[PDB]
Amino acid sequence: VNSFSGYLKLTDNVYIKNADIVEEAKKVKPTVVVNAANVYLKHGGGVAGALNKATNNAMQVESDDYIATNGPLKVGGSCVLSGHNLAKHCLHVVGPNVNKGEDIQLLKSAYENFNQHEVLLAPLLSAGIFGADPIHSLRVCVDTVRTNVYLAVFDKNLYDKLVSSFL
Numbered sequence: 273v274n275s276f277s278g279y280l281k282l283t284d285n286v287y288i289k290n291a292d293i294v295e296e297a298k299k300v301k302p303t304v305v306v307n308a309a310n311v312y313l314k315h316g317g318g319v320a321g322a323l324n325k326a327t328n329n330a331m332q333v334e335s336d337d338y339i340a341t342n343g344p345l346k347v348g349g350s351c352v353l354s355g356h357n358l359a360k361h362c363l364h365v366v367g368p369n370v371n372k373g374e375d376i377q378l379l380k381s382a383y384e385n386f387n388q389h390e391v392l393l394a395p396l397l398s399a400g401i402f403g404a405d406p407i408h409s410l411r412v413c414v415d416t417v418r419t420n421v422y423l424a425v426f427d428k429n430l431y432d433k434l435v436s437s438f439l
């Protein structure tokens with residue numbers, strides 16, 4: 273039993289809800305929140321800009337030190353950093369950004385990072401400003417993640433479309 277409330281159950285392990293991941297994180301305080309990161313951990317907009325704003329820029333400060341030490345992430349890769357006031361940990365995962373020409377086949381690799389964590393609160397990778405089809409992102413998620421994932425979809429119209437078209 274965990275503290276996630278009001279989710280629709282899609283599969284054995286995948287759950288989905290129309291929610292702002294920021295507000296959901298601040299209420300649940302999950303062990304792991306997933307950030308929709310880029311390789312530079314520059315958290316300017318989308319989910320990343322929103323999560324970073326909610327940390328009063330502490331996420332960005334921590335991220336800049338991470339990059340200065342380690343260099344950029346790989347597309348499809350991840351790193352674990354602090355969750356600040358939102359979660360114990362933030363798993364920064366880099367899904368491919370279609371608006372940069374990155375290979376969508378890397379989306380499965382991105383979701384594989386979730387399997388290193390027993391329970392996660394997450395957005396749909398490569399959706400939104402990353403330019404991929406969110407219906408596709410959901411299929412790859414369901415077919416790749418085996419741990420318990422609670423997906424927050426900010427846009428209510430998108431949420432209803434994802435539920436109504438789910439196989």
Ligand SMILES: c1cnn(C2CN(c3ncnc4[nH]ccc34)C2)c1
Binds near residue numbers: 291396399400401403
């Ligand atoms: C293009 C259109 N939208 N997108 C991302 C943004 N997003 C989110 N998912 C859950 N919570 C959120 N809070 C703030 C943003 C956000 C999906 C890319």
